[PDB]
Structure 1
Amino acid sequence: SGYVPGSVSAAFVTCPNEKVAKEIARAVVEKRLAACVNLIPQITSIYEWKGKIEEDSEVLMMIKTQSSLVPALTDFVRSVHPYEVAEVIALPVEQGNFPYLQWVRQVTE
């Protein structure tokens, strides 16, 4: 078959450490809010806070799910994330491997 552009998205989420990242990744995949999560360790986050530059050690999550599920995914991550304001941003997938994209929709449907 084909693929509807933008029907699948990749969401990025930053976590304070590997333990937290793994906990949320397993939960969202089990709850079928996502089909796949890639964890990238050893990240350093830089931003301004209280008039000073902060450099933190974090883990970055790349989450592949149905674009229509991102709101629910964001609600879940927000409810269990240790941060008061968790970074969750999602980008639409326009092209790719159809059987893979088809799989993302099925296991999350």
Structure 2
Amino acid sequence: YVPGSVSAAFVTCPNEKVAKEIARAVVEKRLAACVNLIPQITSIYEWKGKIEEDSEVLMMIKTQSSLVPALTEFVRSVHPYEVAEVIALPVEQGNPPYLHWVHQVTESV
């Protein structure tokens, strides 16, 4: 395992149906090895000077770090918002056969 060669990316979505469309497509396209959907989130941020509280879904995405720029761009291309929240945090350690799988199921088309 090379530290930092896998990453967990977060993306938030307006509802569960868009989240699952997008989760299903990143995996079909091999941009990611798996996606965990966390429903029922409440997002709180400022917009147009006012504080909003939206009902959302958070996606946690496991992919190779070298693929996050293509993941992200795919995300921008389909996402309802027009500035989509994508962040990716490096995996330093883990289950060595899990990490390998992430690499396998996501490499070389």
**Same-fold status (TM-score > 0.5):** yes
Write the distance in 1 (CA, Å) between the matches of 2:81 and 2:49.
Answer: 20
Q: Quick one: percent identity of the two aligned structures?
A: 96
Task: Compute the displacement of 1:51 (Å).
Answer: 1.5
1:4 counterpart SS class: coil
- Post-superposition Cα deviations, 1:1-43, rounded to whole Å, max 9, x if no partner, equal xx00000000000000000000000000000000000000000
Write the distance in 2 (CA, Å) between the matches of 1:16 and 1:51.
Answer: 21
- Could you tell me which residue of structure 2 aligns to residue 43 of structure 1? 41
Report the TM-score, using the length of structure 2 for normalisation: 0.97
Q: Paired residues, what number? A: 107
Runs of 4+ in structure 1 off by over 6 angstroms are none
Report the TM-score, using the length of structure 1 for normalisation: 0.97
Task: Compute the displacement of 1:60 (Å).
Answer: 0.1
1:55 aligns to 2:53 (yes or no) = yes
Write the distance in 1 (CA, Å) between the matches of 2:49 and 2:71.
Answer: 32
1:84 counterpart SS class: coil
Write the distance in 2 (CA, Å) between the matches of 1:71 and 1:89.
Answer: 11
1:38 counterpart SS class: strand
Write the distance in 2 (CA, Å) between the matches of 1:49 and 1:24.
Answer: 25
Structure 1: unaligned runs, 5 residues or longer: none
Write the distance in 2 (CA, Å) between the matches of 1:88 and 1:26.
Answer: 17
Structure 2: unaligned runs, 5 residues or longer: none
- Could you tell me which residue of structure 1 aligns to residue 67 of structure 2? 69
Write the distance in 2 (CA, Å) between the matches of 1:76 and 1:105.
Answer: 19
Task: Compute the displacement of 1:52 (Å).
Answer: 1.1
